[PDB]
């Protein structure tokens, strides 16, 4: 297979449709037409990208197709289905960064004054 | 009815606040202490609070196509930093109190003779 | 039509049957009937054979005057009321008085059991529970006055894929316990009277730890603090041994 | 089971720092005496 | 054609008419029948592709899912002005042990 | 397809009632039914044609009509206590030529002798026991309506905020408290299953509720306490552990360390302010 | 106009509505009648001893004597969570606590300094 | 454990162990 590719960076999320180099391609939400009809100035769409601005957990989650333009929605045989959670300014840490920030702290400090420790030899 | 047509939907997974409008219509427009704040058309049908660990007041209102409708108060109180006294936490102060002056003012006492 | 409960196991073949004599009826259909729901049609033949819907088939008997219909791999969704009617080719259909049917599950585990729920601080009853059966067990009515017994029911939970029998009593009297509640059914030997001496299992409700963001922001303020301790009590003690060794 | 960020490393990790300056401190007090 | 996925009480399930391909991902655990998936808890983020077959109306036929969860649960909160903050903090309080040190490296 | 309203009704002994019946697939044939224990569907009235009605089988006490080819309300002229009954409505295509009849969800109506025997119901929760969550490893949630007349309820279960279908199983008739008496009072049970580590959360919420119907804002009451009308009454609790660690006093433990070491760095900077003053104030009386 | 005003002190809740000069005042929870003749309806508060939450969390209103309901001004929600020996922590009384404790080992430090000096 | 009673008692321990080995370290040389 080729899998979607889903990026969330703040409160924006973008999927990728990776199967069709050249063509039109037209996407799809629960049976309902989304995107390239310019309401909803939060949502757009670009070469093969779909830009969801300020998603929502609870509304707008569920199926995702992407399909050629000129062929029917129920000829589909690869969806999607998505769930995230998402804030304003949230960031995605994990255990072992932590652990390597503590680490690299306490290597500078005893970096520094051993240098100062010969400096002050040196006088 | 009396033009009472906001209400709070609660209770979800993780700890949302959210309001609903109970006017039909598309385009609602909301309200805070009379001062314009948000702007909604459809497939959106409700204002998101934030989290009630932030624990939320102040008074909303929303309108549709007829004029806009009463008021609502809203007040959380879920105290979240807050600290009982028992016999465990009254025992970790002073254990902590005594033992930090004993250390400081034997240090002291070697400073100063 | 015969009225009367009758008891079908978990797949088998069920037969009913109504008798019309004596007319010569043309149109000929069943129909069914939940609990406080409305009818609704399954089947419409007036052709003496098969009409087959899929694992549902009627049949008539011209000259023998009956109908019939035969049910298939049935399971507990099917208890409900069937209702035959007929007519002739003009208006006015005319019914029967209906059949009601029950399905009883596959039980692969049994453990009786009765146990005590715990009471509610704003209403003053006691409710024991008799959970689940062998489906074999009867569970009868009452024998005092103040003692509401309610009768067997069937739950299903897909999440694990398990089917279970139950019967709740309450009161409001006291000298009322489990001990003395289900006296006049008839009960299995070898079931299950706990004793008060509780267990709460440990390593089991370290399964259900759940997590917030407040409560990762706050451990990494502590993580903060306790590095900023250590870096000012290092400057304490170089200072002190300084004062020290003048 | 989900911890998240609250496992116990970190806490026991930040407690062998001072277990490290013990050991130093036991080193040269023996290597006085 | 759609595979239904499903929510109980706090897990995702598969449903589909027949048995369940595995392609990438998740593995799961088979039920007391077959033909339905447990992927776990819906906190622990489950992630995989799935493939079923199909029957009735939909028969000969054949469809694929991809499951994509971020219950965001290691996560922290930060404005952009107090990362600036706590950087200060540390920055002063070495550069204060660093003047602790070369007193004492005189007397 | 064949709708009709309303769903529940209260009334008195004379007094009028109409009561709709709809449909909208362009048929033209329509009827009423009644259905009771032991005698089943018995024909009122029906009407082959936009304007011509006809008589059934117990057609006493019931005026009907045909205006429109959509429409044929039922009107009672005056109630009485034999008219408590459950009311159907049906329809067909064009007189045998396709004999498919569908019938509408239904009415229920009963009639009393007095309004003060209207009552609305009593809600509890009662939380499921250990011995059952060490032995089995499920637990299991009762709720109780108790004490209502008339028998018109309709009960759900609620967890965070949403409607839940499975592992549901509610009694089909409500019971009776005395069964000798005439108006005599009613109850109903209705239970919940889930795993363990599910109850064992204290972060889940689970309710139970029941949907009344009783009398209005146009009826007569001069009678002491509250008026009983269509209202929700329900029961809450929160999924609780008893032994063991959760999350509830972990969020303790973490508040007083961050005051604890608020206060010991505190006492820190005082002492690194002193002995900075000892060693400056030395550096001037070396000068 | 006016909001309410909310006062919460150990386990005991008490509202008040300043919006009617001169009337006899009624109050109201989810539709259900409440105060008057636990809970105890004053001149113009409605006091809520022994507080729950899932009890008392929803709905409330005042409105004047003989009036309906639906007309008043507006309404309140409120859902509390209350406790007993409990002091909840600011950043304020955090001060406090740290201000106070500094200025009183700061004087014990002062002894010791002097009576070691006045010593040797 | 998950419980953090343990790993701050844990260090109170370490705390007062490293100012009586250096009371008794200043008190020898
Ligand atoms: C430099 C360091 C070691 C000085 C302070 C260490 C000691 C004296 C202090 C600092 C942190 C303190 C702990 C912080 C939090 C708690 C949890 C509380 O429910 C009981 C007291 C208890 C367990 C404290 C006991 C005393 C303690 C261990
Ligand atoms: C506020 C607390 C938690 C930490 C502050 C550090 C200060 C107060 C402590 C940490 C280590 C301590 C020193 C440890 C050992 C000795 C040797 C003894 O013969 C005289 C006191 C003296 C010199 C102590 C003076 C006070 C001291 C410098």
């Known amino acids: 297979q080729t899998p979607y590719k889903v990026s969330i960076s703040g409160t924006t999320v973008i999927l990728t449709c990776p199967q069709y180099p050249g063509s039109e391609i037209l996407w799809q939400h629960n049976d309902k037409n989304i995107g390239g009809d310019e309401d909803d100035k939060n949502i757009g769409s670009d070469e093969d990208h779909l830009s969801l601005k300020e998603f929502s957990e609870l509304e707008q989650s569920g199926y995702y197709v992407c399909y050629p333009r000129g062929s029917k929605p129920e000829d589909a045989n690869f969806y999607l289905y998505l769930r995230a959670r998402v804030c304003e300014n949230c960031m995605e840490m994990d255990v072992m960064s932590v652990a390597t920030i503590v680490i690299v702290d306490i290597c500078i400090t005893g970096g520094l004054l051993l240098l100062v420790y010969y400096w002050s030899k040196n006088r | 009815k009396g033009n009472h047509l906001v209400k709070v939907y609660d209770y979800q997974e993780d700890g949302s606040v959210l309001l609903t409008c109970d006017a039909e219509a598309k385009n609602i427009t909301w309200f805070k202490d009379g001062k314009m704040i948000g702007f909604l058309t459809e497939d959106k049908k409700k204002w998101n609070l934030g989290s009630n660990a932030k624990d939320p007041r102040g008074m909303y209102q929303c309108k549709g196509s007829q004029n806009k409708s009463k008021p609502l108060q809203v007040y959380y109180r879920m105290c979240q930093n807050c600290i009982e006294l028992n016999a465990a936490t009254i025992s970790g102060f002073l254990f902590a109190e005594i033992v930090s002056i004993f250390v400081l003012a034997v240090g002291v006492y070697f400073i100063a003779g | 039509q015969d009225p009367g409960p009758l008891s079908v196991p978990e797949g088998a073949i069920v037969s009913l049957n109504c008798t019309y004599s004596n007319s010569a009826f043309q149109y000929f259909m069943w129909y069914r009937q939940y609990s406080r729901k409305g009818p609704e049609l399954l089947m419409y033949?007036?052709?003496?054979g098969n009409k087959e819907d899929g694992r549902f088939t009627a049949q008539v008997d011209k000259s023998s005057k009956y109908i019939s219909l035969f049910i298939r791999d049935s399971q507990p969704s099917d208890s409900a009321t069937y209702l035959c009617?007929?007519?002739?080719?003009?208006?006015?259909?005319?019914f029967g008085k209906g059949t009601m049917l029950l399905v009883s599950p596959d039980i692969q585990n049994p453990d009786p059991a009765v146990y005590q729920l715990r009471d509610s601080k704003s209403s003053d009853k006691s409710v024991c529970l008799f959970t689940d059966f062998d489906s074999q067990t009867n569970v009868s009515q009452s024998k005092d006055s103040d003692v509401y017994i309610t009768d067997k029911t069937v739950l299903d939970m897909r999440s694990m894929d398990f089917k279970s029998n139950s019967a709740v009593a309450w009161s409001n009297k006291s000298d009322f316990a489990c001990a003395n509640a289900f006296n006049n059914s008839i009960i299995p030997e070898d079931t299950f009277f706990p004793s008060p001496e509780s267990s709460c299992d440990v390593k089991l409700v370290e399964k259900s730890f759940e997590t917030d963001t407040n409560l990762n922001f706050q451990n990494l303020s502590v993580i903060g603090f306790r590095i900023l301790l250590l870096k000012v009590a290092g400057f304490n003690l170089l200072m002190t041994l300084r004062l020290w060794s003048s | 089971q989900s911890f998240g960020l609250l496992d116990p490393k970190l806490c026991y990790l930040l407690d062998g720092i001072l277990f490290i300056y013990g050991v130093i401190l036991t080193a040269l007090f023996l290597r006085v005496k | 054609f759609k595979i239904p996925i499903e929510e109980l009480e706090d897990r995702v399930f598969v449903n589909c008419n027949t048995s369940i391909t595995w392609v990438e991902g998740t593995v799961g655990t088979l039920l007391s029948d077959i033909t339905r998936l447990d992927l776990g808890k819906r906190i622990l983020d489950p992630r995989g592709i799935y493939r079923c077959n199909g029957t009735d109306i939909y028969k000969d036929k054949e469809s694929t899912v991809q499951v994509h969860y971020r219950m965001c649960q290691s996560c922290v909160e930060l404005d952009p002005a107090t990362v600036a903050g706590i950087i200060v903090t540390d920055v002063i309080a070495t550069l204060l042990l660093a003047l602790g040190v070369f007193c004492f490296a005189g007397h | 397809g064949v709708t009709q309203t309303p769903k529940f009704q209260v009334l008195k002994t004379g007094q009028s009632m109409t009561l709709q019946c709809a449909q909208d697939?362009?048929?033209?044939?329509m009827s009423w039914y009644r259905q009771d224990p032991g005698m089943g569907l018995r024909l009122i009235h029906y009407?082959?044609?936009?304007?011509?009605?006809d008589q059934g089988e117990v057609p006493n006490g019931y005026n009907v009509s045909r205006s429109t080819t959509e429409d044929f309300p039922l009107r009672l002229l005056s109630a009485a206590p034999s008219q408590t009954s459950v009311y159907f409505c049906?329809?067909?295509?064009?007189?045998?030529?396709?004999?498919?009849?569908?019938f509408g969800p239904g009415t229920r109506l009963t009639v009393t002798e007095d309004l003060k025997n209207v009552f609305p119901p009593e809600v509890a929760v009662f939380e499921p026991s250990e011995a059952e969550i060490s032995h089995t490893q499920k637990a299991t949630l009762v709720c109780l309506a108790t004490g209502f007349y008339p028998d018109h309820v309709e009960l759900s279960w609620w967890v965070n905020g949403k409607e839940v279908h499975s592992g549901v199983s509610t009694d089909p008739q409500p019971l009776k408290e005395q069964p000798a008496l005439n108006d005599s009072r009613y109850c109903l049970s209705s239970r919940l299953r889930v795993s363990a580590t599910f109850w064992q959360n204290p972060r889940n919420h689970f309710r139970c509720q029941v949907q009344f119907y009783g009398l209005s804002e146009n009826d007569e009451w001069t009678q002491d306490r509250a008026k009983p009308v269509t209202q929700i009454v329900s029961a809450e609790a929160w999924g609780r552990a008893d032994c063991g660690f959760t999350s509830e006093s972990y969020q303790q433990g973490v508040l007083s360390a961050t005051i604890l070491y608020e206060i010991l760095l505190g006492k820190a900077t005082l002492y690194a302010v002193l002995v900075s003053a000892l060693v400056l104030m030395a550096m001037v009386k070396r000068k | 106009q006016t909001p309410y005003k909310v006062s919460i002190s150990g386990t005991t809740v008490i509202l008040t509505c300043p919006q009617y000069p001169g009337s006899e005042i009624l109050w109201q929870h989810n539709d259900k009648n409440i105060g008057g003749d636990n809970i105890g309806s004053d001149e113009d508060h409605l006091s809520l001893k022994e507080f729950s939450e899932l009890e008392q969390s929803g709905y409330y209103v005042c409105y004047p004597r003989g009036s309906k309901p639906e007309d008043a001004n507006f309404y309140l929600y409120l859902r509390a969570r209350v406790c007993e020996n409990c002091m909840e922590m600011d950043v304020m009384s955090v001060a406090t606590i740290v201000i106070v404790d500094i200025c009183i080992t700061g004087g014990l430090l002062l002894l010791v300094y002097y009576w070691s000096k006045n010593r040797k | 454990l998950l419980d953090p009673k343990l790993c701050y008692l844990l260090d109170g321990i370490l705390f007062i162990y490293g100012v009586i080995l250096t009371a008794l370290f200043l008190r020898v040389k």
């Open positions: 049906a329809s067909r295509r064009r007189q045998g030529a396709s004999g498919e009849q569908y």
């Open positions: 009407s082959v044609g936009a304007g011509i009605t």
């Open positions: 033949t007036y052709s003496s």
């Open positions: 697939m362009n048929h033209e044939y």
């Open positions: 009617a007929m007519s002739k080719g003009y208006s006015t259909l005319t």
